[PDB]
Design a protein around this ligand. Structure first.
Ligand SMILES: [Mg+2]
Ligand SMILES: [Mg+2]
Ligand SMILES: [Mg+2]
Ligand SMILES: [Mg+2]
Ligand SMILES: [Mg+2]
Ligand SMILES: [Mg+2]
Ligand SMILES: [Mg+2]
Ligand SMILES: [Mg+2]
Ligand SMILES: [Mg+2]
Ligand SMILES: [Mg+2]
Ligand SMILES: [Mg+2]
Ligand SMILES: [Mg+2]
Ligand SMILES: [Mg+2]
Ligand SMILES: [Mg+2]
Ligand SMILES: [Mg+2]
Ligand SMILES: [Mg+2]
Ligand SMILES: [Mg+2]
Ligand SMILES: [Mg+2]
Ligand SMILES: [Mg+2]
Ligand SMILES: [Mg+2]
Ligand SMILES: [Mg+2]
Ligand SMILES: [Mg+2]
Ligand SMILES: [Mg+2]
Ligand SMILES: [Mg+2]
Ligand SMILES: [Mg+2]
Ligand SMILES: [Mg+2]
Ligand SMILES: [Mg+2]
Ligand SMILES: [Mg+2]
Ligand SMILES: [Mg+2]
Ligand SMILES: [Mg+2]
Ligand SMILES: [Mg+2]
Ligand SMILES: [Mg+2]
Ligand SMILES: [Mg+2]
Ligand SMILES: [Mg+2]
Ligand SMILES: [Mg+2]
Ligand SMILES: [Mg+2]
Ligand SMILES: [Mg+2]
Ligand SMILES: [Mg+2]
Ligand SMILES: [Mg+2]
Ligand SMILES: [Mg+2]
Ligand SMILES: [Mg+2]
Ligand SMILES: [Mg+2]
Ligand SMILES: [Mg+2]
Ligand SMILES: [Mg+2]
Ligand SMILES: [Mg+2]
Ligand SMILES: [Mg+2]
Ligand SMILES: [Mg+2]
Ligand SMILES: [Mg+2]
Ligand SMILES: [Mg+2]
Ligand SMILES: [Mg+2]
Ligand SMILES: [Mg+2]
Ligand SMILES: [Mg+2]
Ligand SMILES: [Mg+2]
Ligand SMILES: [Mg+2]
Ligand SMILES: [Mg+2]
Ligand SMILES: [Mg+2]
Ligand SMILES: [Mg+2]
Ligand SMILES: [Mg+2]
Ligand SMILES: [Mg+2]
Ligand SMILES: [Mg+2]
Ligand SMILES: [Mg+2]
Ligand SMILES: [Mg+2]
Ligand SMILES: [Mg+2]
Ligand SMILES: [Mg+2]
Ligand SMILES: [Mg+2]
Ligand SMILES: [Mg+2]
Ligand SMILES: [Mg+2]
Ligand SMILES: [Mg+2]
Ligand SMILES: [Mg+2]
Ligand SMILES: [Mg+2]
Ligand SMILES: [Mg+2]
Ligand SMILES: [Mg+2]
Ligand SMILES: [Mg+2]
Ligand SMILES: [Mg+2]
Ligand SMILES: [Mg+2]
Ligand SMILES: [Mg+2]
Ligand SMILES: [Mg+2]
Ligand SMILES: [Mg+2]
Ligand SMILES: [Mg+2]
Ligand SMILES: [Mg+2]
Ligand SMILES: [Mg+2]
Ligand SMILES: [Mg+2]
Ligand SMILES: [Mg+2]
Ligand SMILES: [Mg+2]
Ligand SMILES: [Mg+2]
Ligand SMILES: [Mg+2]
Ligand SMILES: [Mg+2]
Ligand SMILES: [Mg+2]
Ligand SMILES: [Mg+2]
Ligand SMILES: [Mg+2]
Ligand SMILES: [Mg+2]
Ligand SMILES: [Mg+2]
Ligand SMILES: [Mg+2]
Ligand SMILES: [Mg+2]
Ligand SMILES: [Mg+2]
Length: 247
RNA sequence: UCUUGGAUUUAUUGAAGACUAACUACUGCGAAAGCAUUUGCCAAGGACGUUUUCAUUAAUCAAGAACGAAAGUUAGGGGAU
RNA sequence: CUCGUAGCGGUUCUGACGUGCAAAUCGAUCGUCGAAUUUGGGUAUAGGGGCGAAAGACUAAUCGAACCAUCUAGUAGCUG
RNA sequence: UCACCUUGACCUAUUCUCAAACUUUAAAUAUGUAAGAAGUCCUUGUUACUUAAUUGAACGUGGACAUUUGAAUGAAGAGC
RNA sequence: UCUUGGUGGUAGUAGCAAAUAUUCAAAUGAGAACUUUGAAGACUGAAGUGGGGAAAGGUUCCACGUCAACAGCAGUUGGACGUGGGUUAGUCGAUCCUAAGAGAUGGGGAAGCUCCGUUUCAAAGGCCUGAUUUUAUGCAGGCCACCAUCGAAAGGGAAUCCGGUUAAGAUUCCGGAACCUGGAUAUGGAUUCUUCACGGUAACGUAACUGAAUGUGGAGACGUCGGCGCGAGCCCUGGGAGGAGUUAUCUUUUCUUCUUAACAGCUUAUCACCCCGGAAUUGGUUUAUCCGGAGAUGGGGUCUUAUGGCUGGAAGAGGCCAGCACCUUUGCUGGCUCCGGUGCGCUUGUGACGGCCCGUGAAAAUCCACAGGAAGGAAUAGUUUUCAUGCCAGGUCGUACUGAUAACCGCAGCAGGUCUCCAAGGUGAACAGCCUCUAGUUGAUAGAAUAAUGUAGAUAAGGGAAGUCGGCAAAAUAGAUCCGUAACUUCGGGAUAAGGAUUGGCUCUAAGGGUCGGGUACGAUCAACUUAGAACUGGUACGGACAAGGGGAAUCUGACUGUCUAAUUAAAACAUAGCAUUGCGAUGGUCAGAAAGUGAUGUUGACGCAAUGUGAUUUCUGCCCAGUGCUCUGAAUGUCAAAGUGAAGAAAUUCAACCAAGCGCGGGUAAACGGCGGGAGUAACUAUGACUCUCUUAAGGUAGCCAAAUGCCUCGUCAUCUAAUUAGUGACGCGCAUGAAUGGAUUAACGAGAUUCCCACUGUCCCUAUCUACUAUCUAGCGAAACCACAGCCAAGGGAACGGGCUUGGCAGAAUCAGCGGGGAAAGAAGACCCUGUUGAGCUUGACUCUAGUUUGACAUUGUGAAGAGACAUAGUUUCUUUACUUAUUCAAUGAAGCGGAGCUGGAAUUCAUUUUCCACGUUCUAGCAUUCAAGGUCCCAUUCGGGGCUGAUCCGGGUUGAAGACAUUGUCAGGUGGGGAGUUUGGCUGGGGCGGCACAUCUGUUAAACGAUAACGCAGAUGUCCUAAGGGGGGCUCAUGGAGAACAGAAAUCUCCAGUAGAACAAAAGGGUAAAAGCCCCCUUGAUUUUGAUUUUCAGUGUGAAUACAAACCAUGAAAGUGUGGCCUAUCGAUCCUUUAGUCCCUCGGAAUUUGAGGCUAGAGGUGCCAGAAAAGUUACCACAGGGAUAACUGGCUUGUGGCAGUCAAGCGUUCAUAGCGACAUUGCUUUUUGAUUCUUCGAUGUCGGCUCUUCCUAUCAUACCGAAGCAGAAUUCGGUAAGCGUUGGAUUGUUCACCCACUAAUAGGGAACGUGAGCUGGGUUUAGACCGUCGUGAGACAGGUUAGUUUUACCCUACUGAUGAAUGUUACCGCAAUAGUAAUUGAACUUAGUACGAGAGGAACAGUUCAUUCGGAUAAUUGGUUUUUGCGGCUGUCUGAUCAGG
């Protein structure tokens, strides 16, 4: 008869993002006349590390078209982008790694990252370390493009949506083992309070639907409907098949 | 088992990975295991030719090493048959 | 990582004490001691709620549901 | 044996022993009613009941009988 | 156990015992253990008992006066009491900045208190003018796109130091010496006829050396560890100038002073950089291997000023002395204050590096610089001066003190807790322990004595775990050097494995450094502590105190480090990395919120986030989709709500069709929940059973493992371990009930985890003794509490069954002291177990009823066109179908910046004399720059040295832009889902409750004892039906059965007679009843009918059911008398409310009617079986409350099935012979220690088993003493008597009592004492809360199943006991007596008797006598051992007193 840990996370008290040391919001450059009819030239000045993020951040500096001043955008760095590199964003831009072009104006099989789901929302797809997006199709009348997402799914996005050529840098990170609870401690120190995890079967029945009994056992089926609510969605939510993938 | 929710067939267009028929032989190369679509680059190899050059530098070899079908092992990728 | 101080804990004596020095101490013996360490201040989360490396533990000596006031002189086939 | 010492039960007359859910009989104790005036007797009045029929039935008028008026003991007042 | 207040006994009692410790004298005083001073002894021992601070306190600080209360003794003292004094800032903080966050406004939500949000969807605004005469500087240009405010006395930050001063303030006052900010402002210097400096190749330099808007850059501004370098301070030390100490002797000796601030000038640097040069024969170089043609080495330079040196500050101050004054105002005078060395030292700061990260380690205020060139400006210095000097001001608040064994919190002057800075010498590795210096304290009620029992510390002969549940506690080990070091292993470890030597002192030896140097075959000089070796030496001591690992072989278990039940559970539980599963591509997953123009994840984006499971590595994860969950573009007349449609009706209404989700159907999923079998026969053994035959499966437990922490039986069986093992280990396995991510098996290392063994070791024990300190005791002072009906000597009896009192006995003499744990079923706590309650709570679910949320349908928002297998058959915008518009709505973005359309060219437009037609719009080697309405061009001005347009830069539409679109979304309603959340329910009787049953509503016979009534979970049975006849009537007939007779035919077919009192039948149990019937056969029928009363039984003379007699009818029936109101009689059944039906066509619908419709009256039905009648699933070991001995266990008491022990009788056994010794079939008793029955007492609690310890009692006698009997020759036995005097063991396993074995013994008898004995212990067993396993349940949970951990309180009161005093007897003293009470010894062996008696032999005694021993007891200390504060003597370490001696 007590609210469970998965419910308490939505109140957002001790379960927020530890966001002091982060370098900003890693977004694309705001879609304007420079990036819609020609291009604009940037410059990388730093490849910095983002706290809580496994991918480096490239600080790319552009000139403001309308006022004499410099605008520093923060990109997710692509593997191969270096400091001192000129970076081109726009429609008429050239395909190099780190250039920002619409999905329509890049050919089939192009490998892109920081890809907008809608034109101008400043980067939503292929942002974690190592991941990328492959363009697998085009429908030039009623401009759309078919992609493969990092999950393996197929998405249809506007051809006016943008992307950055290359993979997101920092790949192969999760292939290293953490080896100890300490290295898990400092990974989640700079993300959010989701660590450690107590098993619900290791509890009292007031705390979890899995807890209690004279032996640690689940009692009911762990697969719960999508048509259930909070407090019952403690287990496998809306599972199609369970266990190993052996047919 | 699939099938009137149109299977099987047929046509158009795509993807994926694998494979490289026919030509293909009492034919070739490779130390052996093995090796076939093209073009490019890389270093190599046999045989021939030689009025070149060195002039026994060689033969086989314990111990020791390189390579070693396929299945298998570990971890990524890929999963068309 | 280890031996071991400061520190931080609390194994055993089932030691002392048990109208105590103390509503949890004292002593010896112990765990650990460069990190998932220890800690001050600021700050956030509030009661059927929080918080929980999970013991129904902790949330002002109060916790299988805090504390305060009211409804309330709640009701009692039960005891005085 | 192919009417026989070595037949079983059955029938008839005997015999020993018994019965809470057997009995011809049958106590003790306990128990119902009666021992009168709201009585008995005579005459005959009523009725739609009853009879073949004032016959019966029931309730009566009038008349006969007075405390040994219908066993014993008691009664402390009786009844409501 | 009332309330409030007061008061006692206990009681002058318990006690005032941690933190080494006090002592002498004087002073003050009424009074001194405690005050003050001196002396002495000591301690904290620099991670302090020392100097400061943060929080908190608040005056506690300081002085004077004072001692009533407070300082648990005292008090002249005080943190007390009374009166006062005291806190000084431009520089230290606050103030300011932002952090995590908090929070207004605009705006949205909410009935509202108010909520969200912090830049949002807002018309959110101040900044300078170049510089002043029409300026209160605007009535002007020009610029800026953010958007409150709060948030740190530890973060960021402008600037102050030294000396002195107070009773108490100080980085604040005073004296001296600075600095910063803000403002104003003059002079000098600088620069200027080249108008905004010069020098250097350069790095850069300087005293200056204009610089607007705008932009850019830097600082503020950052982790941790390691080593190295450098600095400061400290420590160590040499020479000298003073002062003090010791001085028998020694000591050029021991201690001590010898200082230099902020600020300023000049110099000072690793790193970095510049020039020259051009490198392999590669060089440079760090402790640490980096660097160099992208230019090393080298030679010259440049810069940062951490930091150091010099000088100013500043010797005038501070220190140390000396001399002279000597109520001198109170000083005056004078000298010295100097020069070094050393370093793996300590603390700290810094610099250059290196290591680490799936961790890469704040922000803002603020300040500066540069880019740019706006504007302004030149005479002998026009401007401008970030150069020097000069002037003024710096507010408000805080400041004292403590910061804790007395200033804070803990009730308080509480051994507790509470953040931080500084940190001397020695020993030593050390911030350890031990001793000392500076500083500080010497506070804690005392004195005397040295009983017991304690607490704390010790030691112990011989043995060495025999102790105990268990090695608990203790001992042992310990530092360092050298040697040596296994199994196993994840190859990193194990590991300090195990083991084994050495260690002092003194005198030496040998290595190991720095600075100094060459010709266009060389040693002066200084300094450090490591290491190795040698000799000599000694009561063979030496890590001499201190400090400091015990180790080994196994098993279980968790990989490890880590975490938790504060205050009983530290673990095997939790976590963990690793592994795996699941969901989600943002209009999203998971979750918030009452809503929201609302939130978390999210400053996010599948290498992510969320939800779970398992838990490192090795090696594996078998079989199951039937169940239930989950899931599926799956089947579409099975079910399908609301809305909508249609039919009938006057209509309310009734019906029908259509019918979304969801359910049902089909499938997939087990690292989802979960599951993983019998009977029988078979191999040339007897059973065993590869294979085989069936029953049911979805699958029938695979790989593995095991009496395992999982196995009841079980202490399984074997082996091993031991003398002996219910332990352990290894095997085996039909395994009650093992098993694969509810993970199976194994696994190095780790572990305050659990278990067994071994070595060492020891007082754990045999078996106890001694010592010290503190208590206790006694004294002065001070002085509680628990508890208390009244109390306090027993035996027996009875009694609510264990009496202090009552009864009958025993007896009994003041007042007491120390102990003590028998008793007071002592106290502590209105039992926490069990029961009762129509008492609650928590958690679970296939209980009931809801509910948020979610899903599905409908209507509104919701408009505009189409095509329309979209109306019913010249027939119509809505209709069981799709896509077209944008303006509602929705999403998103931006400083709403470039949208839409139209306009120049050139063509593979082969211009088709037409853009039917389309395409490109100033930027891509490179880490530069991009700003001033834009220069140019053009035209105008009224031209003023400047100003304005246009074009540069196409025109038009004012639609910011992109999606999405009348669908989501939203409002309302309807169906589903919905233990996530809520509330409620879970009967009773009961030889306690649970379970079973119904004795819960009934019937017959018995119980039941001759009217009636009468209990038990008494007994034997039956009831919830059956019947249109098995009801009613009439007539006829006799039934069960037996005997004899009939072909098949018998023992049983039909037929016939005789006998048949019922021995048959009557629906169903049993009892009763019945023979021209009540039965059997036949005929007719519905009385099993209507209406109202009366009555009987159960009984309240209520109801219900059943029944009896009538009466009014109407029928049946029979010839009729009659009979029939269901069954031959005794059982077979049901209220109010609601619904329904029959009847009358009756009453009413209240303004009056008609018609439906509704309501009403009388009689039935539908039902409550718990049967006088609620609508209801579990568990609780987390439980709780009101009670209850109305109630379970332990004890006592009764009873005595059972257990044991006896007896009578004697068929028989005992070679004959009942009774030497036995004894059947019977029979009569005893015990309460075994086990069973009462719930008698106890629930405002009698502390629950075993053990240990210790006492007493019984006798039903094992031994010992003395005897009797024998089938007693002897020896040894057996049976029996008197007898409880005296003994009655040590161990392995087990928590066990019991058991069992080993072994000794004279013997290892049995019992009682609240199953003797917990204020005597222990806590192993059992009995809370943690945890794991097995079985069972969907689960919560359960198990008189296993395993691990889990606080044991109080005596000082009375009595009892043990010891100790004592009034009274004329006083006093010595010597005695003995009533009464207690009593104590015990047992064995050997020699001799004696190889004798006896015996055929084998064997083989006893009495007397001597000598020893066992167990016990009482002493005693010559000896032997133990003990040591004799601190007696000696030795040793470390430190301290200068050394020595002598000591602490
Ligand atoms: Mg976990
Ligand atoms: Mg738990
Ligand atoms: Mg080919
Ligand atoms: Mg460690
Ligand atoms: Mg350790
Ligand atoms: Mg420690
Ligand atoms: Mg503990
Ligand atoms: Mg204790
Ligand atoms: Mg350590
Ligand atoms: Mg601390
Ligand atoms: Mg809640
Ligand atoms: Mg629990
Ligand atoms: Mg409360
Ligand atoms: Mg009350
Ligand atoms: Mg009877
Ligand atoms: Mg009678
Ligand atoms: Mg009192
Ligand atoms: Mg006393
Ligand atoms: Mg004393
Ligand atoms: Mg000391
Ligand atoms: Mg006092
Ligand atoms: Mg006094
Ligand atoms: Mg004072
Ligand atoms: Mg300051
Ligand atoms: Mg502020
Ligand atoms: Mg900081
Ligand atoms: Mg000063
Ligand atoms: Mg001048
Ligand atoms: Mg100059
Ligand atoms: Mg700067
Ligand atoms: Mg200063
Ligand atoms: Mg420090
Ligand atoms: Mg100046
Ligand atoms: Mg002050
Ligand atoms: Mg002060
Ligand atoms: Mg102070
Ligand atoms: Mg005090
Ligand atoms: Mg020292
Ligand atoms: Mg030393
Ligand atoms: Mg003391
Ligand atoms: Mg000894
Ligand atoms: Mg000895
Ligand atoms: Mg023993
Ligand atoms: Mg021990
Ligand atoms: Mg060594
Ligand atoms: Mg060793
Ligand atoms: Mg070992
Ligand atoms: Mg562990
Ligand atoms: Mg575990
Ligand atoms: Mg494991
Ligand atoms: Mg640990
Ligand atoms: Mg605890
Ligand atoms: Mg957020
Ligand atoms: Mg499995
Ligand atoms: Mg409907
Ligand atoms: Mg043992
Ligand atoms: Mg075993
Ligand atoms: Mg075996
Ligand atoms: Mg087994
Ligand atoms: Mg004493
Ligand atoms: Mg009395
Ligand atoms: Mg008597
Ligand atoms: Mg009493
Ligand atoms: Mg009396
Ligand atoms: Mg009497
Ligand atoms: Mg007596
Ligand atoms: Mg006395
Ligand atoms: Mg005592
Ligand atoms: Mg007692
Ligand atoms: Mg008690
Ligand atoms: Mg009741
Ligand atoms: Mg815009
Ligand atoms: Mg009777
Ligand atoms: Mg019967
Ligand atoms: Mg019945
Ligand atoms: Mg008849
Ligand atoms: Mg019958
Ligand atoms: Mg009968
Ligand atoms: Mg009845
Ligand atoms: Mg009712
Ligand atoms: Mg009306
Ligand atoms: Mg009843
Ligand atoms: Mg009571
Ligand atoms: Mg006797
Ligand atoms: Mg005897
Ligand atoms: Mg005898
Ligand atoms: Mg006796
Ligand atoms: Mg005796
Ligand atoms: Mg005995
Ligand atoms: Mg007992
Ligand atoms: Mg006792
Ligand atoms: Mg225990
Ligand atoms: Mg006790
Ligand atoms: Mg006492
Ligand atoms: Mg001596």
């Amino acid at each position: 008869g007590r609210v469970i840990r998965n419910q308490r996370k939505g109140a957002g008290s001790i379960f927020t993002s530890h966001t002091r040391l982060r370098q900003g919001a890693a977004k694309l450059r705001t879609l304007d006349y420079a990036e819609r009819h020609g291009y604009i030239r940037g410059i990388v000045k730093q490849i910095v590390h983002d706290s809580g993020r496994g991918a480096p951040l490239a600080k790319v500096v552009f000139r403001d078209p309308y006022k004499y001043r410099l605008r520093e955008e923060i990109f997710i760095a692509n593997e191969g982008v270096h400091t001192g590199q000129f970076i081109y964003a726009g429609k008429k831009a050239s395909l190099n790694v780190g250039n920002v072009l619409p999905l329509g104006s890049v050919p089939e099989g192009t490998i892109v990252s920081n890809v907008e789901e809608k034109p101008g929302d400043r980067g939503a797809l292929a942002r974690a370390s190592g991941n990328y997006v492959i363009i697998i199709g085009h429908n030039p009348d009623e401009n759309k493009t078919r992609v493969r997402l990092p999950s393996g799914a197929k998405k249809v996005i506007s051809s006016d949506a943008r992307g950055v050529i290359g993979v997101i840098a920092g790949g192969g990170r999760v292939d290293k083992p953490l080896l100890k609870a300490g290295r898990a401690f400092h990974k989640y120190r700079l993300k959010r309070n989701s660590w450690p995890k107590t098993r619900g079967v290791a509890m009292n029945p007031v705390d979890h639907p899995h807890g209690g009994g004279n032996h640690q056992h689940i009692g009911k089926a762990s697969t719960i409907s999508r048509g259930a609510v909070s407090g019952q969605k403690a287990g496998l939510i809306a599972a199609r098949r369970t266990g190993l993938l052996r047919g």
